[model samples]
Target: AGTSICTSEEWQGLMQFTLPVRLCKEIELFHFDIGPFENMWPGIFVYMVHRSCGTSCFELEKLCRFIMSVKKNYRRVPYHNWKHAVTVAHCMYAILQNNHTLFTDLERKGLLIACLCHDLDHRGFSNSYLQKFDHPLAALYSTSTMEQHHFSQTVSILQLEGHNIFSTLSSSEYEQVLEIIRKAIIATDLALYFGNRKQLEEMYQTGSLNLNNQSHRDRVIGLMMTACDLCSVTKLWPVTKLTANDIYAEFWAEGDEMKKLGIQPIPMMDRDKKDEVPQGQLGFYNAVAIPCYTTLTQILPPTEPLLKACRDNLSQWEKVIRGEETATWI
Candidate 1:
């Protein structure tokens, strides 16, 4: 269950993977460039784990393979890939760092790793597409098709030799952590967001919850997962625009797949309708992004920066919709 699962190198006194954990932490705060992430990911991931949950030095060689495995498993799609996962995980890290009171060891560990694993092996297609075309994943999991498969893939990877970073946990603690991870991964389905939002906002307004209650705690973690997943929209202007473009690139790529099968994509998915992006973004902000950050800030006041950035973007989108040409970026 240890180094036998991975490397031939002996574990005694391996050099640390020297990286700028401080700069990476800065990236988690004020900046998030995906360019450096490809090279920096292992360092960043190891740093995150150590920052939140480390007890002793890991087998560095084994940990290296585990991190690389997670990176290699992600497809080279524009969205829902390794870079996106890293970004989401950074968001979770930032949230936990700022609002440490929000969750404890088990929940914190689950949320961070779940963000990294939540979109594992995404095929750049939606659940509706999978079911409509009778994809194998849809058949395997009749509900939340892609999500269930993502979690399953996450488990598979963790079970592989040299990959169980959680191997240090006691048996019961391991089971509990896995349970939280399962719920957090499934919560990535935006379909589940609305229900969690309603209940979480109610708890916030009413100003109380049985914080010890597992169900209530699950709901909070679920909402936090959604907040982390959509945190792209809360980035500063240029980064937000870049992420939006990256997302549409993935969407239109999927549209090409549908077209080959004689299926017409809706306007938003169609690359040709890109001129309407401003209006589309405005609608998305009002309907989804704004509401999400609003809920986050409402419950966790420290999340106000995210909500502020989102509102700033909302204004830009509104100006574009009103036929005012917005500056390309700041």
Candidate 2:
């Protein structure tokens, strides 16, 4: 297992590659395909970390090994794979770049790393599916099952030889970063988001959510995590459409597994209910995505563009549901 860590030669080779300036600019704008940069992800991750936190905050070898191990741990599932992981990280990077002071240096670094590893070791299954099957992970946590597993996987990787990227921080700062990572990653579970969104909106409405308040700040990061996790909805139609297809592919795969065991799956997860996808998406946007993005925009006005893109996607889905626009699946 020790040999699994990237050697110095491997890290040096990784550092030799850099993303082109055109793609660099596109990444900052929040609308670009990461497929082309698949081979360059390591370099990009290293660059983003250095760009967010100073280079001195991490040992070069440890950071490289940690990033590589994280990417390795993600399953090759349709939607919850390494590509999705990096896309979320890219969204976080774009947000922090646009609103530089929105988070402190420690918060920024923690958020970026958490986004990258939030879905670590995912099996392309939801928390409900895990629980329904009586999986050990479900029994282990009893709530936010997969999220807790993701964080545990993150900790496991950090424990690996030469993989503790936070080792350079003071003991207190290291502890704080771990707390930020755990809260931010777990917040990606939509169950928590549904409740956190309401509280966050209420706080923002009453003007009680000051950045100086740690509790308020933690909730804000939670909201930001969900926004970044689902930023695919705010992307262009092509990107959003393709991403939705991948997500359904994973859901339907789980539904098929459930059916094999004589269990019934929900309509949204049922492959036979493909025609209702647009309607399902509309409900999702109204009930979750749109509200989450709206609350985020209100708290950080620089994030207004995210909400606008989300609304635009909702309108497109509405058109499909109304039969004004034709979709092949429909």
Candidate 3:
């Protein structure tokens, strides 16, 4: 009973990166609606890490600084910026907690850090664009170009001064955690998600899939990363619309760039075809979002909320596409 005096509005301390008492309380209690997204990101993230990993006060301070730095490192591009990364991390945090005690503490750390760093230094262009223009990241990665760059950027940051939040881990643990992070981040590529999901389904049918095994667990970590990365569909309708608009803006901008280079953008990426969003999004959910979450809920039924939210958005989009609806939900 030694609590001191600080108001509810005090969302941060005089010390640079210390999380606010109120933010900690909300994250600890699972009140996610409390936010200006920028502030909520750091506190909720550090709170989850603290709750799950049991780091020291000094460790927490170091982590807070690292998270802030990570936030700054995110490229200021539409839809791939710090706002999006934080939201993705927030989704992963809930998904992990919602499934109860599934992943180990170390795996949780890996998954959490992967979510934070997955899109680090994203240049707001697709891998296809990178290939078309002979982008340097394309040359470096040879596959999953943007994702590879993002993960490499993550490793680079961790190598910097006072930024290795996982410093307390044993040598083996550190190596393993980094490995898990690599798999998780790279698995965000939809190309890999298709293969990963196919393999997971095959394992499920055979009844031989064991989350206790290292290989099986690592694959699940990768799948979870993809699910959280595409979490826009799993949110409520208004959020889905706002997310859709934000991302489409980026897609359109990329199309603009492609136009400037005399490269005709694909239908979805074309600015002149911006009106095609509802239909394209409908296809996206039916093809990708629905099947992914359908399989996930089979494994962890609490994740059904993700599927249901996705279907709700799909239905709404269909209505809008067919001119039978307004933006009523928002």
Candidate 4:
């Protein structure tokens, strides 16, 4: 009934080649200023998704279908919809294609799979929601609370006994891929952003090219995926605009839901009766995403232009927030 699923190792090899190919196609399709090697964002994500799902086009198609089926329940919502997964996947592919030579085949595959599975089973609530409710996901992981549980749940779905994606890999490769996938998936938790940024900065400052030296490939892959996961600013103008709207709208909706549940709304979720759009996205991009991506470019110079585009967009948003004149009146 199902197409023959490739073994993990075989899938990995195919994706290593396919990553570059898909990336080139996407670049041409988008007709952006960047060439094939200049965009690594989507490639990284597809590689990770393929790696985690055993690189079976059949499995990926099924996963995509599963996500699409359930996505309607999360439409118009912030941060938990199928679009978030798709966006992350898109970002990953961009990163890998742009920075193709920086990563090995294994690293690229791991990054792609990690992005695909990162947000599986999201419940549209923040980590605080699980902590406040003492949810089982919090209790089970016993580590980062719901955050860790989310990553585990994603892995479990992909690795359920006979349905296991990693089962086909050699024992060592299986273990290696599992570890890489875990790091990349767990790192997508927004709560870890500050810590991860600090660690990456420290690594750069210390001249610890450990990322360059790692043979496990997962370490660099983890770093790359983490970078793209936070790279909301680095996308092209249209994508950046769309993503900004989606994120703000989702946060607002989540806040409203929390209010209905008698929970105190988190920051920026407090959209009062004001018809004015909140300036939070502007603040976030200018204060956080821009700086983070800029720092990323310093360490990884290839992403500089993408990061600059993010800054440029933030400036544009700042103008709107400050009530500056619009190029076109609505």
Question: What's the CA RMSD for each of the models?
Answer: 3.7, 2.3, 6.2, 7.2
The parts of candidate 4 lying over 4 Å away from their true place are 1-24, 28-78, 160-163, 212-223, 273-278, 325-330
Best by TM-score: 2
Query: Which tens-of-lDDT digit does each residue in 1-330 have in candidate 4?
Result: 112233444333333344556444554221232222423433344444554333563355434433332232233445565556555666666666666677655655655656666766666666766666677766766556645754665555554334454455678876777777777877666566666666666766777746546632443454566556655556665556655566666667767877887887766666673334437666677656775776567666866766777777777777776787344321
**Error at 164, model 4, angstroms:** 3.8
Model 1, TM vs. native: 0.89
lDDT rank order: 2, 1, 3, 4
List clashing residue pairs in candidate 1.
none
Winner on TM-score between 3 and 4 is 3
**Best candidate according to lDDT:** 2
Error of 1 at 184 (Å): 0.5
**Candidates by TM-score, descending order:** 2, 1, 3, 4
Residue-level lDDT of model 3, residues 1-330, one tens digit each, is: 111222223423412455667665545321243225565556667767766656562375457556777876777788898877877777787777776588777887778888988998887898999988998778878999988888888888787666678888889999998998888888999888888888887888798889888888877777778788888777767667777777888888999999999989898888788677788988888888888887787777777777787778788889898897655452
TM-score of 4: 0.72
Give model 4's clash tally: 26
Kindly give the stretch of ten consecutive residues in candidate 4 with the minimal lDDT sum.
Answer: 29-38
Mark the 10 consecutive residues where model 1 has the least summed lDDT. Answer: 1-10
lDDT of 2 by residue, 143-162 (tens): 99999989988998899887
Q: For model 2, what is the C-alpha lDDT against the true structure? A: 0.86
Cα lDDT listed for each candidate: 0.78, 0.86, 0.76, 0.57
What TM-score would each prediction reach against the true structure?
Answer: 0.89, 0.94, 0.89, 0.72
